[PDB]
Design a protein around this ligand. Structure first.
Ligand SMILES: [Ca+2]
Ligand SMILES: [Ca+2]
Length: 341
DNA sequence: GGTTGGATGGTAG
DNA sequence: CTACCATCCAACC
């Protein structure tokens, strides 16, 4: 009946500002340095000082630095970030046990058991915001509404250190006036594909045939946006189990030579097993990105869990199969584990 | 309809 | 960039 969603503001860039106060009120850019050349890699997150001028997540470093020399570029630290994140989800757990952790910086709380209306929800939302800022020193945004999507949207509306309630009549005006672009779970690839055809707002999805929408953007997205445009979305705050853990690393030059790829592949296995942590996958996949960024996978499922040395030995054979089947040089190599027990 | 195989495609931090 | 998931096109119990 009532959902409370929490989103950590510019999370990666914020931990850095808290750990290292020499940085605040300044542009701060968290990067992934691929490993190849100088500036090799992409922006992973950026504070709002860096974002006003187009330095945002996804873009390359050599484009961020030409759009802003100036700023503070920082190697990513997912361990450090994950530490803080685990602690914050633990606080949130005490306000309600029904919690959907959707990612390192997002969570959904169903509070239809703890409050009576939205007014009691807003009070609780400020309270959670205040405890987090006191214990961790992190500003967060809270969205409140009737289903998950509208709680997230409300947070998207309030973003930098904000709180927002989207009640019932506001939900209805949003269906007619909200762009498809601003819908959680709908990226710029889908938005602009629909944009071409005049599908601009959420209500427009109810003006088009289902197979026409399906044949354009696929199954889930078609039913998803249709539910929402009618107001028939209210799926439960379900727990999230990771389906797969894998690592990919970039070589310093393209190679079709078995013995030269091996060191990188083995370095992926080590870090991947690190991440599994007491989990035991029944299945494994090797991923190679070739010369012209083309993706090739071979994997294998087992009637038992895979030991660390079995992976070494099996991953070598899956890399062989790729090399006999594809005559192109490989540029990045990695492994994926799934079908846990 | 279920498992398992492999392919680009998409969303997000 | 990296991480993780989805979509689809396939064989076959
Ligand atoms: Ca987020
Ligand atoms: Ca299928």
């Amino acid at each position: 009946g009532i959902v409370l969603f929490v989103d950590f503001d510019y999370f990666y860039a914020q931990v850095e500002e808290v750990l290292n106060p020499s940085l605040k009120g300044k542009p701060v850019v968290v990067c992934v340095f691929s490993g190849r050349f100088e500036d090799s890699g992409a922006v992973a997150t950026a504070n709002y000082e860096a974002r006003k001028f187009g330095v945002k997540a996804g873009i390359p470093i050599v484009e961020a630095k030409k759009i802003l020399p100036n700023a503070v570029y920082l190697p990513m630290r997912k361990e450090v970030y994950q530490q803080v994140s685990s602690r914050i989800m633990n606080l949130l757990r005490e306000y309600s046990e029904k919690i959907e952790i959707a990612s390192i910086d997002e969570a959904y709380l169903d509070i239809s058991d703890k409050v009576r209306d939205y007014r009691e929800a807003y009070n609780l939302g400020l309270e959670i915001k205040n405890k987090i800022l006191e214990k961790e020193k992190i500003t967060v945004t809270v969205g409140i509404s009737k289903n998950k999507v509208f709680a997230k949207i409300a947070a998207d509306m309030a973003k930098p250190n904000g709180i927002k309630v989207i009640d019932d009549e506001e939900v209805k005006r949003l269906i007619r006036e909200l762009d498809i672009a601003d819908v959680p779970g709908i990226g710029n690839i889908t938005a602009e594909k629909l944009k071409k055809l005049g599908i601009n707002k959420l209500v427009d999805t109810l003006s088009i045939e289902f197979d026409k929408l399906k044949g354009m953007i696929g199954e889930a997205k078609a039913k998803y946006l249709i539910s929402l445009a009618r107001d028939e979305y209210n799926e439960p705050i379900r727990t999230r189990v990771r389906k797969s853990i894998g690592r990919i690393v970039t070589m310093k030059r393209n190679s079709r030579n078995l013995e030269e790829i091996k060191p990188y592949l083995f370095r992926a296995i080590e870090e991947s097993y690190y991440k599994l942590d007491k989990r035991i996958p029944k299945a494994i996949h090797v991923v190679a990105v070739t010369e012209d960024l083309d993706i090739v996978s071979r994997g294998r499922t087992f009637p038992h869990g895979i030991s660390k040395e079995t992976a070494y030995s099996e991953s070598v054979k899956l890399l062989q199969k790729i090399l006999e089947e594809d005559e192109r040089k490989i540029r990045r190599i990695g492994v994926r584990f799934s079908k846990f027990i």
